[PDB]
Amino acid sequence: MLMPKEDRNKIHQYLFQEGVVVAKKDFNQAKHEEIDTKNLYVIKALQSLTSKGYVKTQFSWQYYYYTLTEEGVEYLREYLNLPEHIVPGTYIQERN
Amino acid sequence: QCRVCSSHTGLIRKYGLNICRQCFREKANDIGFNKFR
Amino acid sequence: IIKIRITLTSTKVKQLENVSSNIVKNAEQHNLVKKGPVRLPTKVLKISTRKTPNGEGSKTWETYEMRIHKRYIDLEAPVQIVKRITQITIEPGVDVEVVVASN
């Protein structure tokens, strides 16, 4: 399963204030808002990302769930090389 | 769709809920269906 | 100051005669014009499905049921009278609607 790395905004970016990946068991339509795949990309890419931890997968009638935790400060804060108090996941928003 | 319990056939297309009927008997309670007669 | 119409179509018959009573209660403490809660014929849903996961065995079936009751009231009041009282008669499982149809 190839990981094509053309666009980090459609790989891992704007979940720093989301922290969640809703998905679907799908198959070939290649268009999904609010997430980084088209309809296949981050699905097979979270497969690598689950295997380093930091995302937890329920199935729950074929809707893939993912959420972040403590072992996520080690990539996002440095690949996007941004300081603290603006990225984080445990404080994902203005209140959460 | 094939939902869960070895079924893509015998789907309940009526009332717009689309459940495999093997997996309806265990979910018909909390939908709010109940047998009386 | 406009003739209105309220509908409520719920599925807990004990929790529809408390609501329809306090609707006609606070209207009659302000003594508006009204017509009584007209109760419609109820609707039942049913689906026959046989009772085995596999297919090997004798044959008769189930029958499931779900009951929907619906009744509605027409009313006229000044808007300041009604726009407060429709927000204090909430209860879970119950639906409330306002119709001001004056064609």
Place this chain on the structure above:
Amino acid sequence: ALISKKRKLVADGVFYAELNEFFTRELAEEGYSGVEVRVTPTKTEVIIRATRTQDVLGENGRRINELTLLVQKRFKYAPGTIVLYAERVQDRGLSAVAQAESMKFKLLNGLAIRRAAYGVVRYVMESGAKGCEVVVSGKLRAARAKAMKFADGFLIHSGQPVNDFIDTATRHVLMRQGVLGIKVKIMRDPAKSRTGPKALPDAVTIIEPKEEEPILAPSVKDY
């Protein structure tokens, strides 16, 4: 708009039937068994009920608006109006719906199943039950499908009491030992009901009447 009438009373049940799954599949401790959806004008208030709201609150919003960001985004619901009001869910054995969750997990972290079994019983049959019902039918270290069993009571089911005594109660395993679809049914004691009937329909009780005056000599009096 363009809204079908009776389907909105059946689609929400499908919406009811799937939200409960995470309160099964994500939590184990607090007892948040019964979900409850309260739809007010323009807000869906499902009441968060947690005995230990630090998984959810934590550092002022550990999972208040963290669990919502899945489910509100799952149904394409609007943010902000997904109100999840915090509360405490009810007691462990001293509730009705929790008797699912009371025994959803209380088989052991690794010792003998009889000493698992005989623990669960003596609590609530004296302290707030005359009927509950769990499920066990498994083996002991051989190639047999042996079936030893237990329960605590006869239930209360007398007609339509099948359909208010059965409820939304489907809770899985947090046990080290035994995994399959485990189910629990719950039909409590009737002496403390406060919602509807209070005794079984065979029960009859006549009252005492009081001791009598002897003969009542006339002694008529004129007020």
Place this chain on the structure above:
RNA sequence: GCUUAAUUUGACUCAACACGGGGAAACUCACCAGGUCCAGACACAAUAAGGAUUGACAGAUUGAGAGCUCUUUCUUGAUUUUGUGGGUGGUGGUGCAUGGCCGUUCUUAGUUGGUGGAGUGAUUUGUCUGCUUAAUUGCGAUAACGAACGAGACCUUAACCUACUAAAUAGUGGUGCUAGCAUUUGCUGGUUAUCCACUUCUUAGAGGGACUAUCGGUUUCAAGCCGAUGGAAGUUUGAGGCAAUAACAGGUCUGUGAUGCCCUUAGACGUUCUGGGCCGCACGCGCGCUACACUGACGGAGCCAGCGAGUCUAACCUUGGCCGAGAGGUCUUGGUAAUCUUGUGAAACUCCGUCGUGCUGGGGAUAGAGCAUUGUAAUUAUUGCUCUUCAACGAGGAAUUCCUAGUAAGCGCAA
């Protein structure tokens, strides 16, 4: 069974065989002889710019669908193609190890304790001879007297409420505008809004009412069973739902088996992209379908119902006016729901006729010519209307039956 390029298989006494909700083509896909491209978590490594690849061909190539061939300008850029060893990878053609509840069955028409009796003891009485009941239902006898689960009870329905209270999303009763009117007082109409007054019929909440009542027989005069008159109702008042002892290793959904070989990782598990699954001659136990006719066909009329269903991110119901012989086509509307389709003008039956007992006008089983629709596509007729052809078939040997008084049978044509 045969057959096969494969006819994908599960299940054989009631308890297999119109059933796995198995009514049909490419969805299903489990199968057959072609085509595919996708196989990587980490930890290994090398060509990692002087080159893998990302080339997807880039279109003539290229013979054979965009193609897998380079003839080259590369987004080139070590992603990963790669090369392995762990462990991956992961999912689908079966169930199995620390858990089963889902079914069908023998159909709890019966199981079990508390203090008492009897035995050294395991064990036993209660839980019986008799009558009675749909029923270990009950009376009676009695070293046994109270009692639970199951059966009663309950629960949902169908029948009675001139007693409520409350009806432009039901209906009548008037006042009218208003047309007929034999007319002459009259009997049929008239519709938004002409307005008022009504609940009997209608719908849904709250209650009531039946208990075998009351008399006559019969019986250990007991449990009860038979008549009687009243009564909406006197077959548990009619019909269902719900109730656990057991060997069918058919209970498997991202059941996991909480099995280690299924290739279980150039996968024989995916897709798109391919013709061939239930679909081949001479006999059925496949549960009635259309018969074998004058209590009948055919033709004219007469014309009565019940429970259910439905369109927005989208084609569902469909009435008039339309053309045409149907089949249909076109123009419109109406309907998110007692309002619209829909009084769902259903069929048998019903009168008036034609027909004349012959396998004739009963009965259309194989067929050739045609017009239409539905989708990417109907040949091996997917269905439907035309005209032709009318072929087994004169009540059925031996045998043997899902269906109980508005029941058995016909007659429906709603989901």
